[PDB]
Tab-separated table of C-alpha atoms in Angstrom:
chain	number	residue	atom	x	y	z
A	1	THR	CA	30.293	-40.519	-22.927
A	2	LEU	CA	29.158	-37.032	-24.206
A	3	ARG	CA	28.370	-38.306	-27.528
A	4	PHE	CA	25.296	-40.285	-26.176
A	5	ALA	CA	24.455	-38.145	-23.368
A	6	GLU	CA	20.833	-36.713	-23.054
A	7	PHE	CA	20.528	-32.874	-23.436
A	8	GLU	CA	17.731	-31.004	-22.378
A	9	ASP	CA	16.942	-27.180	-23.072
A	10	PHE	CA	14.883	-27.536	-19.692
A	11	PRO	CA	14.692	-23.783	-18.614
A	12	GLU	CA	12.140	-21.901	-18.359
A	13	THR	CA	11.681	-21.050	-14.542
A	14	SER	CA	12.012	-18.078	-12.253
A	15	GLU	CA	15.170	-19.551	-10.649
A	16	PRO	CA	18.375	-17.464	-11.115
A	17	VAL	CA	20.935	-18.982	-13.693
A	18	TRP	CA	24.287	-18.047	-12.399
A	19	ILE	CA	27.590	-18.583	-14.366
A	20	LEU	CA	30.797	-17.813	-12.794
A	21	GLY	CA	29.922	-14.949	-10.618
A	22	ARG	CA	27.099	-13.536	-13.202
A	23	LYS	CA	23.461	-13.667	-12.744
A	24	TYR	CA	21.014	-14.159	-15.670
A	25	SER	CA	17.171	-14.779	-15.922
A	26	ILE	CA	16.341	-17.527	-18.196
A	27	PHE	CA	13.278	-15.459	-19.522
A	28	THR	CA	15.079	-12.487	-20.545
A	29	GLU	CA	18.884	-13.377	-20.918
A	30	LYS	CA	18.839	-16.738	-22.791
A	31	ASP	CA	21.037	-15.828	-25.293
A	32	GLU	CA	23.356	-14.296	-22.910
A	33	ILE	CA	23.703	-17.322	-21.012
A	34	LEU	CA	24.105	-19.464	-23.853
A	35	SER	CA	26.885	-17.011	-25.142
A	36	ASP	CA	28.429	-16.915	-21.925
A	37	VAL	CA	28.624	-20.846	-21.491
A	38	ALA	CA	29.913	-21.036	-25.320
A	39	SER	CA	32.425	-18.519	-24.807
A	40	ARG	CA	34.441	-20.394	-22.068
A	41	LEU	CA	37.412	-22.514	-23.264
A	42	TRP	CA	36.171	-26.162	-23.694
A	43	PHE	CA	39.064	-28.823	-23.634
A	44	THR	CA	37.859	-32.219	-24.537
A	45	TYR	CA	39.664	-35.520	-25.073
A	46	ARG	CA	42.145	-35.243	-28.134
A	47	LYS	CA	43.644	-37.774	-30.450
A	48	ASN	CA	46.629	-37.872	-32.834
A	49	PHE	CA	48.545	-35.296	-30.995
A	50	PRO	CA	52.412	-35.968	-30.740
A	51	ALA	CA	53.282	-38.947	-28.690
A	52	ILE	CA	54.036	-38.100	-25.164
A	53	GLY	CA	57.476	-38.216	-24.264
A	54	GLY	CA	58.062	-39.624	-27.442
A	55	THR	CA	56.792	-43.121	-26.950
A	56	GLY	CA	53.426	-42.396	-24.679
A	57	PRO	CA	50.002	-41.842	-25.759
A	58	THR	CA	48.690	-39.872	-28.825
A	59	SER	CA	45.336	-39.521	-27.277
A	60	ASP	CA	43.905	-38.909	-23.861
A	61	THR	CA	40.669	-40.539	-24.226
A	62	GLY	CA	39.707	-42.606	-21.402
A	63	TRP	CA	42.354	-41.231	-18.968
A	64	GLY	CA	42.602	-37.427	-19.381
A	65	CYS	CA	39.338	-36.272	-18.327
A	66	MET	CA	40.437	-34.533	-14.882
A	67	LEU	CA	43.095	-33.150	-16.739
A	68	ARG	CA	41.054	-31.707	-19.239
A	69	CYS	CA	38.745	-30.275	-16.342
A	70	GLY	CA	41.809	-28.791	-14.802
A	71	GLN	CA	42.846	-27.083	-18.317
A	72	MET	CA	39.361	-25.552	-18.440
A	73	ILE	CA	39.328	-24.151	-14.849
A	74	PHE	CA	42.953	-22.644	-15.581
A	75	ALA	CA	41.990	-21.376	-18.878
A	76	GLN	CA	39.141	-19.394	-17.597
A	77	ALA	CA	41.497	-17.818	-14.980
A	78	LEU	CA	43.923	-16.720	-17.991
A	79	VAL	CA	40.729	-15.470	-20.057
A	80	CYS	CA	39.880	-13.258	-16.650
A	81	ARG	CA	43.659	-12.488	-16.522
A	82	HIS	CA	44.302	-11.511	-20.343
A	83	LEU	CA	40.782	-10.664	-21.561
A	84	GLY	CA	38.516	-10.085	-18.752
A	85	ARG	CA	35.169	-11.559	-17.447
A	86	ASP	CA	33.300	-9.447	-19.800
A	87	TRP	CA	34.807	-10.995	-22.872
A	88	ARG	CA	32.552	-13.182	-25.099
A	89	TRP	CA	33.244	-15.298	-28.071
A	90	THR	CA	31.388	-14.845	-31.338
A	91	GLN	CA	31.855	-16.491	-34.541
A	92	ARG	CA	32.520	-13.834	-37.284
A	93	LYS	CA	34.328	-11.416	-35.278
A	94	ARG	CA	38.167	-10.866	-34.812
A	95	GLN	CA	39.268	-12.021	-31.191
A	96	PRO	CA	42.138	-10.440	-29.541
A	97	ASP	CA	45.811	-11.519	-30.052
A	98	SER	CA	45.684	-12.297	-26.224
A	99	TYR	CA	43.013	-14.674	-26.859
A	100	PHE	CA	44.826	-16.764	-29.413
A	101	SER	CA	47.940	-16.788	-26.958
A	102	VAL	CA	45.893	-18.198	-24.338
A	103	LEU	CA	44.272	-20.843	-26.401
A	104	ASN	CA	47.856	-21.497	-27.890
A	105	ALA	CA	48.595	-22.292	-24.123
A	106	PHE	CA	46.558	-25.437	-24.062
A	107	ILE	CA	46.992	-27.003	-27.508
A	108	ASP	CA	48.186	-30.785	-27.794
A	109	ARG	CA	51.765	-29.993	-28.102
A	110	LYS	CA	54.903	-30.315	-25.636
A	111	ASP	CA	55.756	-26.430	-26.208
A	112	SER	CA	52.475	-25.318	-24.822
A	113	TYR	CA	52.731	-24.311	-20.920
A	114	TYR	CA	49.461	-26.159	-19.973
A	115	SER	CA	49.282	-28.868	-22.820
A	116	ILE	CA	48.295	-32.512	-21.813
A	117	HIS	CA	51.809	-33.211	-22.429
A	118	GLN	CA	53.008	-30.961	-19.780
A	119	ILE	CA	50.372	-31.629	-17.226
A	120	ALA	CA	50.871	-35.525	-17.813
A	121	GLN	CA	54.824	-35.256	-17.296
A	122	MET	CA	54.570	-32.850	-14.274
A	123	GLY	CA	52.068	-35.624	-12.910
A	124	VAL	CA	54.759	-38.073	-12.803
A	125	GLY	CA	56.597	-36.024	-10.091
A	126	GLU	CA	53.391	-35.775	-8.042
A	127	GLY	CA	53.637	-39.674	-7.805
A	128	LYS	CA	50.920	-40.359	-10.844
A	129	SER	CA	51.742	-42.442	-13.627
A	130	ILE	CA	50.787	-41.316	-17.178
A	131	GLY	CA	47.115	-42.897	-17.396
A	132	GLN	CA	46.637	-42.795	-13.524
A	133	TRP	CA	43.492	-41.299	-11.877
A	134	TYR	CA	44.187	-37.738	-10.824
A	135	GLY	CA	42.022	-36.105	-8.025
A	136	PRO	CA	41.158	-32.330	-8.159
A	137	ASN	CA	44.176	-31.529	-5.674
A	138	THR	CA	47.057	-33.577	-7.876
A	139	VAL	CA	45.596	-31.230	-11.093
A	140	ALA	CA	45.677	-28.336	-8.949
A	141	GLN	CA	49.401	-28.924	-7.831
A	142	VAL	CA	50.408	-29.479	-11.433
A	143	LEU	CA	49.056	-26.428	-12.656
A	144	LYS	CA	50.811	-24.285	-9.899
A	145	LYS	CA	54.384	-25.871	-11.182
A	146	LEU	CA	53.485	-25.311	-14.498
A	147	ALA	CA	52.545	-21.706	-14.449
A	148	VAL	CA	56.047	-21.093	-13.071
A	149	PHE	CA	57.277	-21.105	-16.896
A	150	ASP	CA	54.385	-18.844	-17.949
A	151	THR	CA	56.180	-15.387	-17.461
A	152	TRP	CA	53.437	-13.761	-20.161
A	153	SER	CA	50.672	-14.342	-17.348
A	154	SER	CA	52.763	-14.193	-14.357
A	155	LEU	CA	50.274	-15.667	-12.193
A	156	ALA	CA	50.196	-16.752	-8.487
A	157	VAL	CA	48.643	-20.106	-7.757
A	158	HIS	CA	47.708	-20.892	-4.381
A	159	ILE	CA	46.364	-24.247	-3.091
A	160	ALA	CA	44.802	-23.701	0.167
A	161	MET	CA	45.082	-27.192	2.266
A	162	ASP	CA	43.649	-27.844	5.590
A	163	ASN	CA	40.364	-26.065	4.560
A	164	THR	CA	41.930	-22.637	5.464
A	165	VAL	CA	42.934	-19.615	3.505
A	166	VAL	CA	45.961	-17.630	5.384
A	167	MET	CA	45.899	-13.890	4.067
A	168	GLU	CA	49.371	-13.457	5.054
A	169	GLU	CA	50.507	-16.383	2.902
A	170	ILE	CA	48.645	-14.837	-0.159
A	171	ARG	CA	50.233	-11.489	0.109
A	172	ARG	CA	53.583	-13.235	0.743
A	173	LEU	CA	52.940	-15.064	-2.700
A	174	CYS	CA	51.327	-12.272	-4.708
A	175	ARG	CA	53.066	-8.998	-3.509
A	176	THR	CA	55.762	-8.231	-5.995
A	177	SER	CA	56.756	-4.847	-4.421
A	178	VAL	CA	55.722	-2.760	-1.175
A	179	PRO	CA	52.454	-1.135	-2.240
A	180	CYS	CA	52.593	2.652	-3.409
A	181	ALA	CA	50.401	5.649	-1.552
A	182	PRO	CA	52.636	-4.361	-14.434
A	183	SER	CA	52.348	-4.817	-11.753
A	184	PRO	CA	52.521	-4.638	-8.024
A	185	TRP	CA	50.383	-7.977	-7.291
A	186	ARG	CA	50.571	-11.261	-9.289
A	187	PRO	CA	47.199	-12.027	-10.270
A	188	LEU	CA	46.060	-14.862	-8.105
A	189	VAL	CA	44.597	-18.406	-8.929
A	190	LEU	CA	43.134	-19.649	-5.650
A	191	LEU	CA	42.286	-23.392	-5.773
A	192	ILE	CA	40.522	-24.859	-2.658
A	193	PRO	CA	40.413	-28.807	-2.477
A	194	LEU	CA	37.747	-30.008	-0.395
A	195	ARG	CA	36.039	-33.397	0.502
A	196	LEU	CA	32.112	-32.622	1.278
A	197	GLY	CA	30.991	-35.791	2.429
A	198	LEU	CA	31.746	-39.535	2.791
A	199	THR	CA	30.254	-40.950	-0.613
A	200	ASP	CA	27.700	-37.888	-1.304
A	201	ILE	CA	28.034	-34.234	-0.517
A	202	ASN	CA	26.342	-33.327	3.169
A	203	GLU	CA	23.462	-30.825	2.429
A	204	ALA	CA	24.572	-28.399	4.868
A	205	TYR	CA	27.350	-27.558	2.328
A	206	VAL	CA	24.833	-27.082	-0.518
A	207	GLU	CA	24.294	-23.534	0.091
A	208	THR	CA	27.727	-22.578	0.541
A	209	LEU	CA	28.859	-24.382	-2.537
A	210	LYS	CA	26.095	-22.273	-4.592
A	211	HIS	CA	27.355	-19.012	-3.113
A	212	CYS	CA	30.860	-20.079	-4.402
A	213	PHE	CA	29.413	-19.495	-7.870
A	214	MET	CA	27.841	-16.364	-7.080
A	215	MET	CA	31.127	-14.296	-6.410
A	216	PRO	CA	32.792	-11.965	-9.141
A	217	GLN	CA	36.018	-13.909	-8.565
A	218	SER	CA	34.304	-17.352	-9.065
A	219	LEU	CA	36.363	-19.748	-11.509
A	220	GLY	CA	33.875	-22.533	-10.647
A	221	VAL	CA	34.651	-26.001	-9.448
A	222	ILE	CA	36.393	-29.003	-10.811
A	223	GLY	CA	35.371	-32.549	-9.517
A	224	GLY	CA	34.714	-36.170	-10.208
A	225	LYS	CA	34.484	-39.253	-9.900
A	226	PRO	CA	37.171	-41.640	-11.735
A	227	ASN	CA	36.795	-41.156	-15.561
A	228	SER	CA	33.609	-38.745	-15.432
A	229	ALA	CA	35.246	-35.412	-14.245
A	230	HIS	CA	33.343	-32.300	-14.987
A	231	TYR	CA	33.982	-28.488	-14.870
A	232	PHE	CA	31.099	-26.863	-13.239
A	233	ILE	CA	30.544	-23.200	-14.131
A	234	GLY	CA	27.399	-22.410	-12.398
A	235	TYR	CA	23.949	-23.493	-11.287
A	236	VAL	CA	20.249	-23.106	-11.652
A	237	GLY	CA	17.751	-24.447	-8.873
A	238	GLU	CA	19.192	-27.483	-7.323
A	239	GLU	CA	21.507	-28.343	-10.369
A	240	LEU	CA	25.014	-27.519	-11.325
A	241	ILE	CA	25.760	-26.354	-14.767
A	242	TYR	CA	28.841	-27.835	-16.254
A	243	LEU	CA	31.483	-28.403	-19.429
A	244	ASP	CA	31.972	-31.933	-20.070
A	245	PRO	CA	35.504	-33.223	-21.542
A	246	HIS	CA	33.950	-36.624	-22.710
A	247	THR	CA	34.363	-36.525	-26.202
A	248	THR	CA	37.314	-37.332	-28.655
A	249	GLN	CA	38.132	-34.648	-31.270
A	250	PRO	CA	41.144	-34.529	-33.817
A	251	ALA	CA	43.962	-32.520	-32.669
A	252	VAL	CA	44.177	-29.114	-34.181
A	253	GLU	CA	47.364	-28.494	-36.316
A	254	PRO	CA	49.633	-26.158	-34.325
A	255	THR	CA	50.214	-22.507	-34.987
A	256	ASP	CA	51.815	-21.146	-38.013
A	257	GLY	CA	51.150	-17.355	-37.251
A	258	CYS	CA	48.532	-15.880	-34.702
A	259	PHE	CA	45.304	-17.456	-36.157
A	260	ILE	CA	44.137	-21.043	-34.800
A	261	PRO	CA	40.826	-22.623	-35.926
A	262	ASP	CA	39.067	-22.429	-32.751
A	263	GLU	CA	35.353	-23.942	-33.198
A	264	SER	CA	36.180	-26.970	-31.319
A	265	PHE	CA	37.311	-25.224	-28.211
A	266	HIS	CA	33.936	-23.799	-27.770
A	267	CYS	CA	31.002	-25.770	-26.417
A	268	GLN	CA	27.987	-25.190	-28.333
A	269	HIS	CA	25.483	-28.089	-27.244
A	270	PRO	CA	22.851	-27.419	-24.796
A	271	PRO	CA	24.756	-26.955	-21.470
A	272	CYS	CA	24.838	-29.988	-19.184
A	273	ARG	CA	23.158	-30.114	-15.833
A	274	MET	CA	23.323	-32.576	-13.173
A	275	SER	CA	21.807	-32.401	-9.706
A	276	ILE	CA	23.986	-30.999	-7.037
A	277	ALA	CA	22.809	-34.368	-5.030
A	278	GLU	CA	24.729	-36.387	-7.796
A	279	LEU	CA	27.953	-34.368	-7.241
A	280	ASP	CA	31.055	-36.789	-5.976
A	281	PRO	CA	32.286	-35.056	-2.629
A	282	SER	CA	35.730	-34.736	-3.691
A	283	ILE	CA	36.195	-31.269	-5.450
A	284	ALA	CA	38.554	-28.017	-5.635
A	285	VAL	CA	36.734	-24.723	-5.827
A	286	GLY	CA	38.733	-21.726	-7.876
A	287	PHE	CA	38.736	-18.023	-7.476
A	288	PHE	CA	40.579	-15.428	-9.489
A	289	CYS	CA	41.812	-12.290	-7.880
A	290	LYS	CA	43.507	-10.184	-10.579
A	291	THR	CA	44.649	-7.063	-8.011
A	292	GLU	CA	44.937	-7.135	-4.277
A	293	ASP	CA	41.505	-5.047	-4.208
A	294	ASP	CA	39.816	-8.002	-5.950
A	295	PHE	CA	41.335	-10.350	-3.400
A	296	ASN	CA	40.130	-8.029	-0.510
A	297	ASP	CA	36.726	-7.972	-1.851
A	298	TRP	CA	36.831	-11.814	-2.224
A	299	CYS	CA	38.047	-11.986	1.651
A	300	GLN	CA	34.836	-9.972	2.722
A	301	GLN	CA	32.370	-12.056	0.602
A	302	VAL	CA	33.845	-15.058	2.400
A	303	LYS	CA	33.461	-13.279	5.736
A	304	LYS	CA	29.598	-12.677	4.866
A	305	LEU	CA	29.117	-16.488	4.197
A	306	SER	CA	29.985	-17.351	7.984
A	307	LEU	CA	26.389	-16.448	8.534
A	308	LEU	CA	22.590	-17.380	7.646
A	309	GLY	CA	21.120	-20.549	8.080
A	310	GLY	CA	23.768	-22.356	5.844
A	311	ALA	CA	26.518	-21.577	5.185
A	312	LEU	CA	27.947	-23.614	7.046
A	313	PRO	CA	31.295	-22.715	5.449
A	314	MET	CA	33.464	-25.391	3.802
A	315	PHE	CA	36.939	-23.509	4.461
A	316	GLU	CA	37.989	-20.731	6.737
A	317	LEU	CA	39.953	-17.452	6.096
A	318	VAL	CA	42.721	-16.550	8.538
A	319	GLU	CA	45.160	-13.739	8.791
A	320	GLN	CA	48.086	-15.726	9.997
A	321	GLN	CA	48.671	-19.663	11.243
A	322	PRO	CA	50.981	-20.711	13.723
A	323	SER	CA	53.337	-22.475	11.117
A	324	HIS	CA	55.694	-24.621	12.943
A	325	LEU	CA	54.522	-28.327	12.009
A	326	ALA	CA	51.235	-28.978	10.206
A	327	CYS	CA	50.105	-29.934	6.747
A	328	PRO	CA	49.204	-30.706	3.693
A	329	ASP	CA	48.413	-33.484	3.222
A	330	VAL	CA	44.918	-32.599	4.862
A	331	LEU	CA	41.260	-32.432	3.916
A	332	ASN	CA	38.874	-32.317	6.520
A	333	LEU	CA	35.349	-33.838	6.994
A	334	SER	CA	33.063	-33.267	9.052
A	335	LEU	CA	30.858	-36.259	9.390
A	336	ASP	CA	27.571	-36.936	11.293
A	337	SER	CA	26.111	-39.974	12.472
A	338	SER	CA	26.250	-42.365	10.926
A	339	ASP	CA	28.622	-41.173	8.407
């Protein structure tokens, strides 16, 4: 569907452009905006990769789109983990060796940690047949189990259910050792599944949703919408900015040596935008906290959200929870009359 989408440049207004925790002016920082979007690892449908499980699909066209959005949000976490948020991709420059290793982790082969092969197979353990629809929560759960194998990145993945982030649980997950007076904290990928409305996002949530893209830790949001999943990376005005997986590219021939031809993993078309009002209410918001200090900063930023006209918080932060019978499976809404 991306192939026949309409693309607009459609700046040039005073409204700040926010991409993954960084603020830009369309008037003066247009190139920096476009560089930042193009630098993100983009994952689309692929064809002619090795058959999944020997006998299954050789392409994910028409079924893989939430899996691709899951790949993009997790790739961005790996980019921050290994390369840093300041890293940018440029043609005609040599990228760090860690860049090709991150990219290597998503190529369409069973020996890559987060290949479509590994995601689809792991999804079976989640009750989902190869070809079935994944919501944000199932894709998040799959990425957690997949990351266990990735000793290179050594990430902690926490999926915060019940609209609650429990700080003691995060420390339990991330602390590798008792803290002194790499490393002592497993870099954290925090994913928070949410349901923000009945068929539409409740507009009380809108300002809280925007601020989620405004944190240094922001990984963006994955969301959809059967067969129309997007990776939202930011916003301008009343529109989200997103990366879209809906185009089928030839699989890239796996890596003999360090170098991988990487042009097709970088979105160079005008960035997609849609009204926040068009957004399906089932989402997962991500944050990356590389050190405990980042996590503490993120916690402070969440507390400051509990004020102003709206927020209107979509999740709560608590030090500890009386956990002797609870859930998942639980998401919460939060419906007015007559929703």
